[PDB]
Amino acid sequence: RGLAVGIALVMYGRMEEADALIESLCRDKDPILRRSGMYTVAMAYCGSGNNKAIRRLLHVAVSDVNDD
Amino acid sequence: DLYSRYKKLQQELEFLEVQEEYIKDEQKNLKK
Amino acid sequence: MITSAAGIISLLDEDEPQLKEFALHKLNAVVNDFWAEISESVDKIEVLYEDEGFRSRQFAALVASKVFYHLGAFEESLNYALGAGDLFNVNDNSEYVETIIAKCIDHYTKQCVENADLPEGEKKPIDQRLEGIVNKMFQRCLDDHKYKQAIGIALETRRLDVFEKTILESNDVPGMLAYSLKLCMSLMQNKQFRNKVLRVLVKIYMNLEKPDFINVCQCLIFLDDPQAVSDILEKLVKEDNLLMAYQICFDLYESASQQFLSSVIQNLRTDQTLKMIKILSGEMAIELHLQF
Amino acid sequence: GSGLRQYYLSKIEELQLIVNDKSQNLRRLQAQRNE
Amino acid sequence: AVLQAATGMYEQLKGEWNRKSPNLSKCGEELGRLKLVLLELNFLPTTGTKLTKQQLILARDILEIGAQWSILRKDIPSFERYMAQLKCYYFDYKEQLPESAYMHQLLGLNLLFLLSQNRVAEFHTELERLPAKDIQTNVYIKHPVSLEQYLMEGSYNKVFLAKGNIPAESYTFFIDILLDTIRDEIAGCIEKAYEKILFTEATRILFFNTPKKMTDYAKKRGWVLGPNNYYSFASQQQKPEDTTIPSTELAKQVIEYARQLEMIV
Amino acid sequence: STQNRRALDLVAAKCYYYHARVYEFLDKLDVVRSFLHARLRTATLRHDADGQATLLNLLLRNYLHYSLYDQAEKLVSKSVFPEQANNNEWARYLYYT
């Protein structure tokens, strides 16, 4: 749980530079690591309005096996 | 103000596309 | 009358160039009404433009473009409008001229956007005629005093030269600069091209009669250039403009990352400079915040 | 004495038509999803 | 000035062509030079208003002569071009232009030529341009449309007989162009309709004069002559091939049904 | 033609239907062809569905009034009828085609 926020913070405000990390975290079998991927999407796209990240977040929100 | 209006309309169109994709996904999972 | 262009089209495959030239000068009078039948002879009217020895080959292009402009194939229409050359007078108020101008601007914007992120080695050279007509359209807004529209097209076309020229040539330099900065921060998303726009904005700001160093500092925070900010601050100290430099330091601490300020401190070290390091470290900023 | 003002208007209206169409379709899809 | 010179130049062509033995090369050069004169004198005017009717009339006569001369040396493209210009000079400026005496004959010539090239779809569209009265009344229009009816319904004997009663001598050339098709069409029926026909029996069917003309056409057609002078056309064995089930197509159709039942959501 | 409003197009199409109609009683139908083609182009460039459909129907009627079936065939071959057109215009377009 701590590392989930930590990994996201490591890539704060990095725009697409976090993509290689994000697709790694979002595809992980660990639900906490998928939560870390969501947080990394948030941190790497802080206020950029990037509709690609919004699309990914909405897709995970509507289709994910873990409520967290 | 023409360019600002045009760019805002472009962003609105892309946002609407995102919203429709999300709505279709949500319907797909809501059936399950 | 002239309900059929079958005869006029039949005046295309003769071996006398005068016959073909007269047929071309007869078709352009009816391309707006009988383009449907000339759509099937597009091949025979474009083979004339393909031939170099034909006198009216440029004209052969123009009429062809008109047919395509009526056919909806705007790509071939703009290609043949380019092939026509000087005969495509952009100053005309005809619907065909402005429609082809719009299609040309869109195609040039797409090509320029594609080339902007492309490596210099793979940068596809844009057609010279396309660039010429786009520059003429830019000059059209420059003469019509529509600076904002030209700024928008320059941003879309990734052409910073016209951007800077429109910013400088405009009567209201500060207002146009504020509009450009707002557009660059709110709409642009390419970052690297946004950084280029910020660079040219800083270039314009530095050359103003009274340099508005505050906007330069903000654009440099966006650009992440500690050296430039430190240089500006140190020449401000040398220039005796200490009040504006104090305001710059406070704005710097308010809205910049700690690593950026640490690099600025290292550049500043290399009395008043001690006060600058004090403000950039921030401790008085929290002093006033805590006191308030 | 207008430059690309007509070009801007054409682009804006071309985007407006698609925006209205997609907004109506999105409203219909949202009604289905809400149901 | 230019109009009078053009009229005299056309008079030269008219005198040369109206001679019982016109010179095709001289007339062709004369027409080629006449076209160049006509370009200056508002050839094929766009939206012809009340301009000089002399230019319109002169261009119409020159195009009529050129169209009638194109078939003299038996070429397609020149006739096509001259007819394309003549149609414009016939139907567009007909308000000011008088009714040409040779207009109906040349229009029927165009229709018969369209029949000769199997461009029947264009034939009907061009036929619809004429008034509905002269289609059933004027002989120059009646002959080609009746020939089209005979060709479509299969009256090939009437198609061959149409050569004898042509409305005009100029109709002759295109007739031959049609006839070469008819034979190759008639045999096409014979292979699929007649299971076996006598050698001489086809003489009236194929409209062959010399029995020798049968042999070359048969070896071109690859017809297996029989010992009893019977051509055996046993070729219906290549049936629609119901022996094979189009299981791929049927599976595709059923899968499309499943899609339209399930893919809707 | 001077104006460039959006809802006016919905009115504009009707005007065209009457604009040709008055010439139908003048029995000219030829001076109207150039105007019809120009307005059809200006409506197609503007994505005016109703005006484009009405102008296409009027052009087809004008072509068929003079038995110019080749011209109408070409026009329907290259032009694209608006899918979101009126039923009363769809009927005319289907009849002419």
**Rounded to an integer, what's the Rg of chain A over CA atoms?**
11 Å
- The structural class of chain A is mainly alpha
Helix segment count of chain F?
Answer: 5
Looking at how many chains there are and whether they match, the oligomeric state comes to part of a larger assembly
Helix content of chain A: 55-70%
Largest interface: C-E, 18 and 21 residues
Main sheet characteristics of chain F: none
Helical percent range of chain F? Answer: over 70%
Helix and strand sequence of chain A? HHHH
What is the beta-strand fraction of chain F? under 5%
Q: How would the global form of chain A be characterised?
A: globular
Count of DSSP strands of chain A: 0
Q: Main sheet of chain A, how many strands, which sense, barrel?
A: none
Rounded Rg of chain F = 12 Å
Cα distance spanning the termini of chain F: 28 Å
Globally, the shape of chain F reads globular
N-C termini distance of chain A:
11 Å
Protein name (chain B): 26S proteasome regulatory subunit 6B
Subcellular location (chain B): Cytoplasm; Nucleus
Family (chain B): Belongs to the AAA ATPase family.
Family (chain F): Belongs to the proteasome subunit S3 family.
Can you offer a commentary on this structure?
Chain A contains 4 helices and no strands. Chain A has helices at 2-10, 19-26, 31-44, 51-62. Chain B is built from 1 helix and no strands. Chain B is mostly helical and 32 residues long. Chain B is rod-shaped. Chain B has one helix at 2-31. Chain E has one domain. In chain E, strands 1-2 form a two-stranded antiparallel sheet. The longest helix of chain E has 22 residues, at 172-193. The relative contact order of chain E is 0.06. Chain F is mainly α and 97 residues long. Chain F is globular, with a radius of gyration of 12 Å. Chains in contact: A-B, A-C, B-C, B-D, C-D, C-E, C-F, D-F, E-F. The C-E interface holds C 1-4, 6-11, 13, 16, 18-19, 22, 26, 29-30 and E 35-36, 39, 43-48, 77, 80-81, 84-89, 91-93. Chain C: The modification N-acetylmethionine is found at residue 1. Chain C: Belongs to the proteasome subunit S1 family. Chain C: This is 26S proteasome non-ATPase regulatory subunit 1.
Salient structural properties:
part of a larger assembly; 6 chains; A: mainly alpha; globular; F: 97 residues; 5 helices; 0% strand; 26S proteasome non-ATPase regulatory subunit 1 (chain A); phosphoprotein (chain E); 26S proteasome non-ATPase regulatory subunit 8 (chain E)
Question: Can you lay out the helices and strands and say which pair or pack?
Answer:
The structure is cut from a larger assembly and holds 2 copies of chain A, 1 copy of chain B (about 30 residues), 1 copy of chain D (about 35 residues), 1 copy of chain E (about 260 residues) and 1 copy of chain F (about 100 residues).
Chain A: H1 2-10, H2 19-26, H3 31-44, H4 51-62
Helix pairs in contact in A: 1-3, 2-3
Chain B: H1 2-31
Chain D: H1 5-34
Question: What is shown here, in short?
Answer:
Chain B has 32 residues and is mostly helical. Chain B has 1 helix and no strands.
